[PDB]
Amino acid sequence: YLAFRCGRYSPCLDDGPNVNLYSCCSFYNCHKCLARLENCPKGLHYNAYLKVCDWPSKAGCTSVNKECHLWKT
């Protein structure tokens, strides 16, 4: 049924904050056919387990994209 077809802007099935599988500083914010990422302060990683942020040594960054320093949020 493909309920997304929006690309990285719809990696979820509903709406809300979710764990990113690629970026490491900006997590995935699911919003309709749009997934706005959110980079933490001081190049921090988002704690998908708490919908918050935290160093990359505690937030466990396992996203395919470890080098989040590739663009500007």
Distance of CA 24 to the CA centre of its chain: 7
Within 10 Å of residue 23's Cβ, how many Cβ atoms? 24
In the chain, where the domains are located: 1-73
Rg (CA), the chain: 12
Domain 1-73 has CATH 2.170.140.10: yes
**56 vs 73: CA distance, rounded Å:** 16
**Bridge-based pairing state of the strands 52-54 and 34-39:** unpaired
**42 vs 57: CA distance, rounded Å:** 13
**44 vs 59: CA distance, rounded Å:** 8
Contacts of 32 (CB under 8 A, 6+ apart): 10, 15
Nearest to residue 8, comparing CAs of 49, 32, 36, 47?
36
DSSP run (H or E) holding 2: none
Contact 26, 38 (CB under 8 A): yes
Contact 56, 48 (CB under 8 A): no
